[PDB]
Amino acid sequence: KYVLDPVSIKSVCGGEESYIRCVEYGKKKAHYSNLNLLAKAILAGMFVGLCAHASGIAGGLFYYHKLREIVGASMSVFVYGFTFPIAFMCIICTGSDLFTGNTLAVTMALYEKKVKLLDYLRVMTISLFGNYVGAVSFAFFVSYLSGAFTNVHAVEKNHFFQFLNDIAEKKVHHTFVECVSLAVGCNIFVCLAVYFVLTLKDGAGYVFSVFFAVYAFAIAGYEHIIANIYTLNIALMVNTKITVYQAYIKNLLPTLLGNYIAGAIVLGLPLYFIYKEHYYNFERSKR
Amino acid sequence: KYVLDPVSIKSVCGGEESYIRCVEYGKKKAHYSNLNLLAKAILAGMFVGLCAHASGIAGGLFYYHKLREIVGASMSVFVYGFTFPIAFMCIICTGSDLFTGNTLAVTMALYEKKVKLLDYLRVMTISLFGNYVGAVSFAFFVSYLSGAFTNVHAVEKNHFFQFLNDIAEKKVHHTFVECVSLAVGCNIFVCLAVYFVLTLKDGAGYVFSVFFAVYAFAIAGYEHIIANIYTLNIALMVNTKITVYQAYIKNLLPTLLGNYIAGAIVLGLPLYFIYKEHYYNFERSKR
Amino acid sequence: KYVLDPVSIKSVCGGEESYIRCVEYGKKKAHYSNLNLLAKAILAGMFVGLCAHASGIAGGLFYYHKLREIVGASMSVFVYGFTFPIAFMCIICTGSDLFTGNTLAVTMALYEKKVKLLDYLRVMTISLFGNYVGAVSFAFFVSYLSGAFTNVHAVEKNHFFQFLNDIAEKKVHHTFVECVSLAVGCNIFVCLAVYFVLTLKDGAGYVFSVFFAVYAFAIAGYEHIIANIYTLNIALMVNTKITVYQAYIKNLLPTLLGNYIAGAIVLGLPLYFIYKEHYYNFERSKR
Amino acid sequence: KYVLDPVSIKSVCGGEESYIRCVEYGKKKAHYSNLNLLAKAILAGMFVGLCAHASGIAGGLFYYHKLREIVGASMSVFVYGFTFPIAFMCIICTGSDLFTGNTLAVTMALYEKKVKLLDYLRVMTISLFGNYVGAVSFAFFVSYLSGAFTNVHAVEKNHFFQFLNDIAEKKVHHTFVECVSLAVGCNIFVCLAVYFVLTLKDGAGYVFSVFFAVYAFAIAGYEHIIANIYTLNIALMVNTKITVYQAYIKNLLPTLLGNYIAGAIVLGLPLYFIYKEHYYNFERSKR
Amino acid sequence: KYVLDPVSIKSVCGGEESYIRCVEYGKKKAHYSNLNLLAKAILAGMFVGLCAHASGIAGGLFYYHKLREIVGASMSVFVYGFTFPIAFMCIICTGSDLFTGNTLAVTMALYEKKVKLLDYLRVMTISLFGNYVGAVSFAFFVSYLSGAFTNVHAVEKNHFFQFLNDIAEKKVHHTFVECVSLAVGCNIFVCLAVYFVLTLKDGAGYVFSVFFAVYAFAIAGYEHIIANIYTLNIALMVNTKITVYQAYIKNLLPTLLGNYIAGAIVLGLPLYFIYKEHYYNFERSKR
Questions:
Q1: Residue C2 is nearest to which of D11, D16, D204, comparing CB atoms?
Q2: Residues A2, C20: C-beta atoms closer than 8 Å
Q3: Is position C120 within any domain?
Q4: Which one of B142, B209, B237 makes the best mutation probe of the A interface by having the most chain A beta carbons within 10 Å?
Q5: Which of B54, B115, B187, C262 fits as disulfide partner to B259, beta carbons 3.0 to 4.6 Å?
Q6: Whole-angstrom distance, CA of residue A88 vs CA of residue A191
Q7: E92: alpha, beta or left, given left = phi > 0 and alpha = psi -120 to 50?
Q8: Using CB atoms, which residue from C3, C9, C204 is nearest to D17?
């Protein structure tokens, strides 16, 4: 028995089905309990801190002072962006929730009258607080207590502290509008990575679409709020040149504002206007 | 219970089914409303601008003045072509429409008498105008307002402005025939990437065929009209050496002409001549 | 409802089914009309010329005269072999026919008495002529008219012409037996890539098996007849050091002979001897 | 017959199904016999030693003394982390058991009252002892007896011994708390790789999620107990600078403690609290 | 009609099903005729010689004498290990048999009383003889007759002969025990690659698991018998420094012994002890 023509399959979907999957995905976050959503948010912040520690070590390896004289910071940022995107896979495969992914899906479910307003504010507040707690807890209990980014004062050995110092100094010197624009550019990639998870339902579609999307903002200098919550706090712990006013007012608040703008307004509102009749049809065809 | 021989499946199709899928894909664009097609075109131009900003930063990192003395512009163009092809995935997974993808599919549906002539002109005009608006809006609101490509006048720090300046000077110095030929070579790759999306219906077939096809024209110096609409306008915004006559007459019009020629004539007309009887059989077997 | 054990599937086949698929694939080429087969051959030659232009630009970028002093021609040939293999995906996904792929499949169908002798000669002649016409048409209308490989006489800028000149001089200096042996080594990889397309019926199996198989012959210095038809003609157009006698007698005829030998004799005849009883059963089980 | 819309499939699962699959996976380890579990543990330790020997040779190639002066140890650690993650695939595809993977799954089955306490201690003890025996047996019978890491005393040839010496000296100079923190960071990645195997049920989902997860801790300097059992014992065999007290007390005991903490407490207990009602529903729907 | 939850599939199997598939795979080799098995073995040796010629050229490109002064032999061995693993795909997709793959599967079928003893000796002898004939035939008719590894005596051009000379001198200087240990380490990877083909039944699972497994022994300096049969014979043909006693007694003999030991004893006997009751149940459930 020989098979000449096998069964034709497909592991992808259209734009209408991707919109309906995203609205149904954001609708489920409002039905968890408070402690369940809080534990998932703390786990997601911990995963972000884990892979950002790994990326900082991998980028400070290529920030060696003799290699830095020839290539600058190019290979450091490339190996950082290569090492980082597994955090999103760790978040998705355990079912954890990130705030920047929720800014598209839960807001889309708010637009479609699937989530109430107080439930929306409750979900977003609990998700942001849990992501902060998880990222700062990983920055203290693993990153600070292992001594990986300690200032060791010798230029042939200090290339991990110096990479953390220069990265934390670069992202704390923007003006308000520049940090808001870079955060908008970040969260468009992050929400599109969530959309890729909802669309391409196989292993390579999970791994490599999210890999290219997260590498693309990690190498562009775009500003993610949870990765900055990890990075600026570990940079404050190991005593880099930044201060706490520079960390929280000059980076974290414009990053939060731009990340919310890119998910709720730039991406969610045109896609709602495009596919709201398809969501209306899907729902009517359930009676 | 042990499975010795599983069920034989297949996530690919033949050339006849790919042609029928492309004609049916281009036939659907003439049935959207004007505002729906306009919003999808604006979103596609925004995605092109997003990943071209990311690619310009990733290429200007490797354009550091000490690395540039050894390797020239080789690693800059390679990392640009590595970072760019996720834009096409962002366009496909949200259901947005690009003009260069439409030049094959909607013209094929025009040849098969599925789209009328005024509907064809309406769809192409709305798609080109929306792609222009989205790309220039991203070039101003994110790329210009973040200060990423500002001339900072110091050779150890000016490697983002200098990469943008040299790229925008290289693609503005062609003659008419050279720019038309490079645009033809670009849009053959872009229309083949659309054909790859219609053929390989899984996650790796979406990601990596489009990756190799878009990297191949990004490293070849081929001319894409929407990427040039982004790049020459951000190069005019940050005050590179090019002028607006050089940007619009010496690059953009021959790129539009060559991109339309490669989709409507070079690729669409032989494929129509090859597979029009298979499309006739597909239609005849629906009565 | 939770899925603990999903449905076991398989997107691969055995050697007997791959042989039967290859004989049935080569049997279909003798049933097209002459103009249909001619148009598919012209499209395949055009795709080969397209991705060879892209690979020549990508390899001449890394052939910069300061990088060439350190690494030689290693990174140029690696980036050429990285950029090239998407040509075969273009050929496969549109349904075009290449001569070197046909030398295995149509000859296997000739051995199994599925194609007559005059139909075999007609199919091979039309395929070779159309591939030549498509490759020389792309070499003139895109590669020559864009000025990408023009001798610009300055050593810091002439690294595209110099890469084309040195590649075209390297592959024109072989003796007859050396060029025949390198062509045999090429067409074994090309016919195995066709066999990979017939065996692995998913997107990653299409992309990456063909990628590794075509990169392996592009970095080995093996001789492909259609890629040489493009390369030696564009090298004659931009006035490199080779002549037309060296291009056509010293390279193209031994490449044609070795490419036919590797498909019809080295690969097709042992596989026919191995799997002809399976093809006999497959045919006997259709009555 | 043309297929326009194929059958929609999916090779991924949700978080609840991944939890149920992990509890059912850890429940099966307590039902093997003692010799079966011991043989699987010895095979897993042998695979870890195999791919760590391969990674040590691949990293000592890039630790050449003229390349080490420019890039430091960056390319050595990158090629180590590139070469290493196939060990886990070798462990999964043969059905072998690793201790660090078991610390999540068997502890989750202990929390759900599926494994008794003495069965838990028996499974963990037999798994750790077999992994130790397999790793030290590969370190002697292949790594030591082949002479690959012999001190050859000449700086142009000693780059395998020097890479092993510097890696074994770096991971033996930590304090207790630093080694515990790095081991926690390691076993979060290892348990998430086990979770990726249970979630993404296709070939790319097996290969590349595990690749990125294991590369991410191999480049971060995180501490795996079985890889350290191989590495410190082969470093003691070829007479590096470390001692047996430094190997066993200063590295191996804090690595065991942190690896158990990250699987049983950091990852297993929140996921149990999140998904224990879904496991209760899965069991209630089997009567 | 929108698909919200598609059909859950799986392209992987467990360890018991992989063992049963391996025993049934090795049991089929004893049922071929002598000429069929001989032709498949000759084809497998030819494929090994093909991709080893390609890997030798790709590694001698990066062995350029100015690059060799900085990085040593690191990039040469990396590009060799990158280029090599497509040989295994060429062997699998045509249905050819390699001796090193057979040492696990046919010995497992011997342990399960599925193959008799004389049939076992006949299959192993015919497979080894055909692999030798195919590898030496490719080493003469393609590798030697093309002049690719000729000593050209100029240090700026002799980097293919010098890479072949130094590789053939490195692998001929081991002691008996060192070559046996390196051959054991090789054939564990080769038999695990065969196991990966039997387990992961999709295109990425075929390509990339075999890629990483074969790259891992190609960069580790592990000794494969068929690749050494090619390499030492082409090194004797182009007159390197080795002799025929060094080639056949000091390398080939211990490589054959270690490759048989790693398949029949190290890997086959524990896996037989683990899964023989599952094979008994699989057979008992066929009556």
A1: D16
A2: yes
A3: yes
A4: B142
A5: B187
A6: 11
A7: alpha
A8: C3
Q: Which of D101, D115, D26, D108 is nearest to D275 (CA)?
A: D108
Is A74 within 8 Å of B64 when comparing Cβ atoms?
Answer: yes
Closest CA to D187 of D109, D96, D264: D264
Q: Which residues pair with B8 in a beta bridge?
A: C10
CA B146-B148-B149 angle, to 5 degrees, is: 125
Resolution (A): 2.3
Identify from E206, E208, E215, E238 which residue to disrupt to test chain C contact, counting C C-beta atoms within 10 A and taking the largest count: E206
Contact A221 B8 (CB under 8 A): no
> Shortest Cα distance from E10 to chain A (angstroms)?
10
Kindly give the pairing relationship between strand B7-10 and strand A7-10. Answer: parallel
Q: Flag if B3 and E20 touch (Cβ within 8 Å).
A: no
The answer to the question of residue B8 being in a domain is no
Query: Which class for A287: exposed (0-12), middle (13-18), buried (19 or more C-beta within 10 A)?
Result: exposed
Q: Identify the chains in contact with A, defined as 3+ C-beta pairs within 8 A.
A: B, C, D, E
* Tokens (6 digits) for D99: 């201790």
What's at D269, amino acid-wise? Answer: L
Q: Which of B11, B51, B141 sits opposite A9 (nearest CB)?
A: B11
Chain D nearest-CA distance from B272, in A, is 17
| Shortest distance, CA C283 to any CA of chain A (angstroms) | 11
Cα A128 to Cα D129: distance, rounded to the nearest angstrom: 43
* Chain center to CA of E41: 12
Domain membership of residue E84 (yes or no) is: yes
Identity at A167, one-letter amino acid code: I
- Report, in angstroms and rounded to the nearest whole number, the Rg of chain A calculated over CA atoms: 20
Measured between CA atoms, how close is E273 to chain A, in angstroms? 33
Burial B33-46 (b: 16+ CB within 10 A, else e): eeebbbbbbbbbbb
Helical ranges in E112-153 per DSSP H: 117-138
Q: Is D272 helix (H, G, I), strand (E, B) or coil?
A: helix
Number of structural domains chain D divides into: 1
CB contact under 8 A, E142 and C185: yes
The CA-atom distances, in angstroms, between B24 and each of B28, B30, B105, B109, B263 are: 7, 11, 8, 7, 16
Residue B106: inside a domain, yes or no?
A: yes
Amino acid at C80: Y
Experimental technique: cryo-EM
CA C203, chain centre distance (Å): 20
Q: Do B83 and A216 touch (CB under 8 A)?
A: yes
3-state helix/strand/coil string of chain C: CCCCCCEEEECCCCHHHHHHHHHHHHHHCCCCCHHHHHHHHHHHHHHHHHHHHHHHHHHHHCCCCCCHHHHCCHHHHHHHHHHHHHHHHHHHHHCCCCHHHHHHHHHHHHHCCCCCHHHHHHHHHHHHHHHHHHHHHHHHHHHHCCCCCCCCCCCCCCCCHHHHHHHHHHCCCCCHHHHHHHHHHHHHHHHHHHHHHHHCCCHHHHHHHHHHHHHHHHCCCCCCHHHHHHHHHHHHHCCCCCCHHHHHHHHHHHHHHHHHHHHHHHHHHHHHHHHHHHHHHHHHCCC
Range of the domain at B59: 15-285
Give A9's DSSP letter. E
Kindly determine whether residue B219 and residue C141, on different chains, have CB atoms separated by under 8 Å: no
- Give the nearest partner residue to D2 out of B203, B204, B282, using CB atoms: B282
Q: What is the CATH number of the domain that holds D170?
A: 1.20.1080.10
Chain E residues interacting with chain A (CB cutoff of 8 angstroms): 2-4, 6, 9, 204
Nearest CA in chain B to D204: B204
Q: What is the dihedral of CA E198, E202, E205, E208, to 10 degrees?
A: 120
